[PDB]
Design a protein around this ligand. Sequence first.
Ligand SMILES: *[C@@H]1O[C@H](CO)[C@@H](O[C@H]2O[C@H](CO)[C@@H](O)[C@H](O)[C@H]2NC(C)=O)[C@H](O)[C@H]1NC(C)=O
Ligand SMILES: CC(C)CCC[C@@H](C)[C@H]1CC[C@H]2[C@@H]3CC=C4C[C@@H](O)CC[C@]4(C)[C@H]3CC[C@]12C
Ligand SMILES: *[C@@H]1O[C@H](CO)[C@@H](O)[C@H](O)[C@H]1NC(C)=O
Ligand SMILES: [K+]
Ligand SMILES: [K+]
Ligand SMILES: [K+]
Ligand SMILES: [Mg+2]
Lengths: 992, 265, 39
Amino acid sequence: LDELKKEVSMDDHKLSLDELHNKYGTDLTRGLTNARAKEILARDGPNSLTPPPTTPEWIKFCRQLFGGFSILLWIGAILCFLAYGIQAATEDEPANDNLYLGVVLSTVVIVTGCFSYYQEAKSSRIMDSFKNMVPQQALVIRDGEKSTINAEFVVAGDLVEVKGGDRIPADLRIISAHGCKVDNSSLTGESEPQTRSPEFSSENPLETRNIAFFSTNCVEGTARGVVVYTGDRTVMGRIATLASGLEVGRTPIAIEIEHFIHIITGVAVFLGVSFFILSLILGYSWLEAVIFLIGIIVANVPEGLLATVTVCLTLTAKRMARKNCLVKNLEAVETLGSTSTICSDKTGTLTQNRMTVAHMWFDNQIHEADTTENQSGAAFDKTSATWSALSRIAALCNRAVFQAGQDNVPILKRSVAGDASESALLKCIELCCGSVQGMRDRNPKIVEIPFNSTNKYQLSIHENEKSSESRYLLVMKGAPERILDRCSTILLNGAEEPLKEDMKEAFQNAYLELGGLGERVLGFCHFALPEDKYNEGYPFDADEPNFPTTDLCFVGLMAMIDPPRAAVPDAVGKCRSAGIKVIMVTGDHPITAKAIAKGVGIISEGNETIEDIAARLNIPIGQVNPRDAKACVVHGSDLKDLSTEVLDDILHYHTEIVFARTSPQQKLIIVEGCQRQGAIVAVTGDGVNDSPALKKADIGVAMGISGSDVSKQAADMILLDDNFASIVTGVEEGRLIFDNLKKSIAYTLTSNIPEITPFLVFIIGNVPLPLGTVTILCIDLGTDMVPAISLAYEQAESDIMKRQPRNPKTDKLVNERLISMAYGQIGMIQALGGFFSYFVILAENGFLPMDLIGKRVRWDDRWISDVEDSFGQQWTYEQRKIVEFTCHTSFFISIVVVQWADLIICKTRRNSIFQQGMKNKILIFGLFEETALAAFLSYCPGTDVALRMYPLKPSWWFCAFPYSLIIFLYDEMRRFIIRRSPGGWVEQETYY
Amino acid sequence: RTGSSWFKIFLFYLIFYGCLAGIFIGTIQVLLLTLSDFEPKYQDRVAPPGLSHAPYAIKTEISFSISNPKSYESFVKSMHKLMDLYNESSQAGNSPFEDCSDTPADYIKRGDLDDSQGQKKACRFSRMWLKNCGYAEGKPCVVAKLNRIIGFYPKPLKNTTDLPEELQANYNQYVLPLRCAAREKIGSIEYFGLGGYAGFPLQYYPYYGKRLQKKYLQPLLAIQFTNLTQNMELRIECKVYGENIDYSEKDRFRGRFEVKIEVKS
Amino acid sequence: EGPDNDERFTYDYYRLRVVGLIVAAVLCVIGIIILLAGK
Ligand SMILES: *[C@@H]1O[C@H](CO)[C@@H](O[C@H]2O[C@H](CO)[C@@H](O)[C@H](O)[C@H]2NC(C)=O)[C@H](O)[C@H]1NC(C)=O
Ligand SMILES: CC(C)CCC[C@@H](C)[C@H]1CC[C@H]2[C@@H]3CC=C4C[C@@H](O)CC[C@]4(C)[C@H]3CC[C@]12C
Ligand SMILES: *[C@@H]1O[C@H](CO)[C@@H](O)[C@H](O)[C@H]1NC(C)=O
Ligand SMILES: [K+]
Ligand SMILES: [K+]
Ligand SMILES: [K+]
Ligand SMILES: [Mg+2]
């Protein structure tokens, strides 16, 4: 469906103005007829974007109500009402058991539904942001007259007019223009104004001057044009549809959840029906056969687990909110940890998005300035008298000014009225020479010649601030070579000197080096005009050369670039140390893209492209073995004629990849290419041209300050302070939460065994029921909750940023090793500790373990109010039941006591508690509150009716203590083996 | 689903579960080692004695038809089961039985809950003390019973103040009374027991337990309802009175009966 | 005692409940203290 939109567009900028009118039945001068425009409206439809059909929240909520655990809990809830119905008909049961348990279980499903619904959130308003880029109104020429109309009423063929400050209402063929410049950052991510004129200037319509696009704005001048595309058919309207239309897809974390749901659901249905038939064979009435099944359901399903996961995710997202990293989708909290490839935009993401002075060439020396936002570098020069001469030209031969009321904000961050290069120079001098306004007050400008297309230079004449002179100084800047052809002397370390071929060659060298760094280079020179030849009232003519512009003194060079953000180089290296592959994907030109790649460490030192090898060896590129080149730089124009299989080979064959001059669909294609190889991919960006890629990414991260509204709609995560170091933190947090989820899951599952085994022995042994159904829910929904959550606050056991990204195909959240430990080893020890306390309670009340076998028949018989114990005493029905429920209560408390040790062992997968310590305060809180809850549930009056919880005698609490301790020792010995031999036996069997 | 590794994981879980079973058993050993053979550690959960009868009630109810044979043959099965134990052939010789007062007497202490003596000798009880009661084919002859509790001394109420069966045949010193009731007085209560009294003779106490007193016999109290009514559910409650006797709204068998007789004939 | 051994069939479930609830409360307070050591 969207495969059409993933392709590069076709256009009609090649046609003549006249020819273009024939195609759209239009007038170049009079414009369309009121009737013809209305006709075309009904024909083509409105100049608007329609949002894609969404899935209502209704269906979204209910889709969770049927996912493995909820299905089993539904079967339980209904099976409760089943047994209740069968009762209400047969023998009038005045009880509330099956009825209430059926109500409780149905509530558990609904509430669990809210948790998973909260986790599976999708806040997407892509198409809405795009719609915000179409103006409310447009100016059209109809019947030879200009009028404002609803922009939706704009059709292909009419004559539109735009001017500085307004949004392009539709894709236009420029037919007339006067000084028109446009901001195409929507399509390129670059905000430098692009001229628009009627002349065709490139085969590529996205590069030609005679096309203006919807989603962009006119920055200055005026233009008229013929509408060629409207609504969904515009270049960026298609990007809108592509972006808004892209299928979301399941996250890595989501896939893991479903996976263990299958496992646990599997064992649940297995043991469920495996013992349902095992009971009927033993001659159990279907009346009972279902009651046992309900218990089996409740025992096997970890009722509180899915909600635990959600809370652990939420708590991890809260910590990241506190580092200026907003998470829109709870699952995106983990994806960053599983990320193996980052596709990053350059401008406004890796870079500050601001022309900044990078180097200066004066005194036959290359000086480097500090490009960082917060200025974390050092000085270059202050002493040289040459510097002050260059500094003066940079301030004086400059027409840029700071906007009013910025004195509060830092120099480099403040808004400037002017072109990017003049702003850069302004901020450079203001920083290291103080107020520039002061320099422009001490040296009043009397005449100037602003930068001309033809002159290729800008000159200014000022009254020298010096009192002993107060004469006229000439300054000029422009193209380095043009400035050179106008110089005779060079200000070396203070004093001038003739411009010999020697210094002239050093100039060329300096010029070539700076240009090689991808930096824009300017020349600077001045000339102190002779006093006798220029009186204090001498008039200077700016129109006609009234003053010399030759034999001037060359002062120096200055170079500039849109520099990396301070934290970016280090963040890139850190991603790469964690084994994450970092690719650059930018709409910017290749020379600039490549230079920043080396600056931030995308391309490491020494690595070459095929073009680099060819130039170094002075040989044809076809003569170069492409396998000798680990780095590559792909232009979008070449990308366009490559198949995906060939794109896949590029991705496979290079470690250091730069995709430059890419369109928005091309970014999507590169992302998909990476994913196709089985990689989890993150995208980082800030422009509307990142929207499709951000949507398709497993996780999209947008910049918060510099980011466009669209990009932040398309993302899963926002960096609110533009701190790229947050990606590094995000991946670290993502890995940590993945491990801690394992700990929390194992902990929760472990207590399933002591809830399952009592029901089994109840059938096979014919003893009184050791633990009840209600009692199970008091564990999974009550006591285990806070402890399970607390594992989310566990510190790393080792340097997680030192390991490679997990293999999502092999490294699962819940594997066989977890089940073996939780179900086969620790849970089994917990089961016994439960049974022990059960036998203790009964034996101390007169029913010794031996006489318990095959007694349930008489025990449950409501009409036998005289059962004989081991000592020959006789018990009524309600009397023995009180002891039985007291058994449920102590078995319950036994679970809590054995979960104490389990909580401590689940703390660490490898390390010892004596190494990791007990610095998790939430965990300790869990221990205290868990025990408080259990005690309250046993001793609070009335709980014997609502939950069948009975007061325990002090000695009862200590039954499971020896089992709780064996768990601690056992797991500590086991992990001691793991560490002592990384070999594999204990490791490959039990290492979560 | 591994390789030959299936063996190594079998060798593990075999030894592992073996140890766990051996430990579980060990903790059961020590538990038993802390317990007496003659007396349970706790008795507060049987404390107030329950009162149970022979007619096995479907739901605290015994409804049947006099004009039908197999209508009551179900209740006669359980009635027989109990009384078959009070046979004279079961109580033979001076061991381990003893002839006790044919009239309600005081308690009898055979020492402590020790094995320092043989089987503590229990009082004989003749089912022949149960006058009038196949059993009552019309108007049932229910048999009451006080639940056995080791070392329990059932203490009758003293005639200090007012009483339900106000002072009639009040053998204050040696009888634990049992008065059945329904207002709703559409019946005819008739009690049979030891010495002809409507109670339990205190000479059968305290019970020394199964280990120290096997073949022991607890006193019975036969109750006959020769009601002149027919074809209606009659809620009859038999209540025992005493210092150590109490009741509960939950446990409807805590020192009392709940019988729903209906001679639907 | 002899016939006056009523205490054998008695248990102070009332005190046990009072003590149990005291303990539960204090464990609840202790937990808050440790948690609130930083929020
Ligand atoms: C318990 O007592 C009854 C009543 O005596 C015994 O019943 C048998 O003996 C009666 C004469 O004493 C006969 O009239 C009955 O037909 C006969 N009934 C049965 C069911 O056998 C009964 O056998 C005695 N049981 C024991 C075990 O001693
Ligand atoms: C109540 C009692 C009788 C039930 C005992 C169940 C035992 C036999 C179960 C419980 C957990 C189970 C193990 C759980 C995990 C694994 C790892 C997997 O890669 C192979 C099977 C294996 C090794 C299972 C074998 C059987 C097992 C040990
Ligand atoms: C009980 O049986 C005796 C004979 O043993 C008889 O005289 C008497 O009438 C019976 N009593 C009743 C109330 O039927
Ligand atoms: K469970
Ligand atoms: K995404
Ligand atoms: K559980
Ligand atoms: Mg950008």
